[PDB]
């Protein structure tokens, strides 16, 4: 089970696709909810995501249907289509998924943020970095619900540099586009969701704290944070969760004026990647780094909760550290940082010490030696 949020607000969830095309925005929204008696949210909602994951895992295609059997009925603890909790303006996080992931697989993070009073928009990238995604070929196809699926692209050694960079730039653009969509919805523009879901977007009118905006993401999503910040000053700070820095162009490193927080796992990181993180550092800029003891790359994603301790450890989904312990640390430290750099008047400053990695399961900075 994916843990419930630790904050005082109940959490809701819905999907938004606008426009319907492959150039539209697709996001999963987590938000503070009015109601708590709704059905929980289906974690991986279509079979084609399992088919996609099977390609990403490099397994036999037929394993897709086995993954679907095993995980196709799992829910995540967010009230599906619950009304938005009215009467208060909420800061906004735009969230970027890793390679071979998609919008729904970081619900532990998104739900927790929501439960503390954030709206979270988890983008689904159309760069062929998702295991799968979908859209509609045209206006007609969206009416009858005739989905077109786009699957993960496999790269040759010789495309890696170039195509990963094209992808991160598209990702940044998709993050900025999602922001603009949400900000327009806030300023009351009628948006007809391309998905026919019982959730009126008019609810979101005057409900965003328009200047309190951050971008967060895991791995490929972490590079996406950094590209996004450099391109869009509307985002006021970023949190990169175990960032994979390879996609970034040489030009971006000196061009990130906003505060940036690296939350790393112990076992993923390596000198080449850490050196790149350190190229974001500069005497005039606000930079923080911590490393979660006993953690692996997958502690930041939902599949760290989907299996038992033993097969979890074997499959590199779980580390030595407990998965709830690990995510609590990442989520609480994230909240404190956001409070500091968005200027929120909440109680997240209780976790300030975690930004400095001052905790028995934290390492200040990095464990990786670079020389
Ligand atoms: C370093 C990465 C990489 C780079 C090149 C080749 C291979 C891997 C880039 C990246 O984003 N990574 C994280 C992928 O996290 C996932 C993936 C699928 C999932 F279902 C879930 C979940 N839950 C999480 C791995
Ligand atoms: Cl290295």
UniProtKB/Swiss-Prot annotation:
Effect ascribed to mutating residue 61 to A: Impairs the association with LDL particles
MF (Gene Ontology): 1-alkyl-2-acetylglycerophosphocholine esterase activity; calcium-independent phospholipase A2 activity; hydrolase activity, acting on ester bonds; phospholipid binding
Class of the enzyme per the UniProt entry, highest EC level: hydrolase
Outcome reported for the amino acid change (mutating residue 232 to N): Diminishes activity
Cellular component annotations (GO), alphabetically ordered: extracellular region; high-density lipoprotein particle; low-density lipoprotein particle
Impact reported for residue 284 to A: Activity is higher than wild-type
Tissues expressing this chain: Plasma. Secreted by macrophages (at protein level).
Effect ascribed to mutating residue 315 to A: Impairs the association with HDL particles
Record keywords: Asthma, Disease variant, Glycoprotein, HDL, Hydrolase, LDL, Lipid degradation, Lipid metabolism, Phospholipid degradation, Phospholipid metabolism, Secreted, Signal
Job description of the protein: Lipoprotein-associated calcium-independent phospholipase A2 involved in phospholipid catabolism during inflammatory and oxidative stress response. At the lipid-aqueous interface, hydrolyzes the ester bond of fatty acyl group attached at sn-2 position of phospholipids (phospholipase A2 activity). Specifically targets phospholipids with a short-chain fatty acyl group at sn-2 position. Can hydrolyze phospholipids with long fatty acyl chains, only if they carry oxidized functional groups.
Name of the protein this chain belongs to: Platelet-activating factor acetylhydrolase
Organism: Homo sapiens (Human)
Section of the entire sequence shown: 55 to 425 of 441
């Amino acid at each position: 089970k994916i843990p419930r949020g630790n904050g005082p607000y109940s959490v809701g969830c819905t999907d938004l696709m606008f426009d319907h095309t492959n150039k539209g925005t697709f996001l999963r929204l987590y938000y503070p909810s009015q109601d708590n008696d709704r059905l929980d949210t289906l974690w991986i909602p279509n079979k084609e995501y399992f088919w996609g994951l099977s390609k990403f895992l490099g397994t036999h295609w037929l394993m897709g249907n086995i993954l679907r059997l095993l995980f196709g009925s799992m829910t995540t603890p967010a009230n599906w289509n619950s009304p938005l909790r009215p009467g208060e303006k909420y800061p906004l996080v735009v969230f970027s998924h890793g390679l071979g992931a998609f919008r729904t697989l970081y619900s532990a993070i998104g739900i927790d943020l929501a439960s503390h009073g954030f709206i979270v928009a988890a983008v689904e990238h159309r760069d062929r970095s998702a295991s799968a995604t979908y859209y509609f070929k045209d206006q007609s196809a969206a009416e009858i619900g005739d989905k077109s699926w786009l699957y993960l692209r496999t790269l040759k050694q010789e495309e890696e540099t170039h195509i990963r960079n094209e992808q991160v730039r598209q990702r940044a653009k998709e993050c900025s586009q999602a922001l603009s969509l949400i900000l327009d919805i806030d300023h009351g523009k009628p948006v007809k969701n391309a998905l026919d879901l019982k959730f009126d977007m008019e609810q979101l009118k005057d409900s965003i704290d328009r200047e309190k905006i951050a971008v967060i993401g895991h791995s490929f999503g972490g590079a996406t944070v950094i590209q996004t910040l450099s391109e869009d000053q509307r985002f006021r700070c970023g949190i990169a969760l175990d960032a994979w820095m390879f996609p970034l162009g040489d030009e971006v490193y000196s061009r990130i004026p906003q505060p940036l927080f690296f939350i790393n796992s112990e076992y993923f990181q390596y000198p080449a990647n850490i050196i790149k993180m350190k190229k974001c550092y500069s005497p005039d800029k606000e930079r923080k780094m911590i490393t979660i003891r006993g953690s692996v790359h997958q502690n930041f994603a939902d599949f760290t909760f989907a299996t038992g301790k033993i097969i979890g450890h074997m499959l590199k989904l779980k580390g030595d550290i407990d998965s709830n312990v690990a995510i609590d640390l990442s989520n609480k430290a994230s909240l404190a940082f956001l409070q500091k750099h968005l200027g929120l008047h909440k109680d997240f400053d209780q976790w300030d010490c975690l930004i400095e990695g001052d905790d028995e399961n934290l390492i200040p900075g990095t464990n990786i030696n670079t020389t």
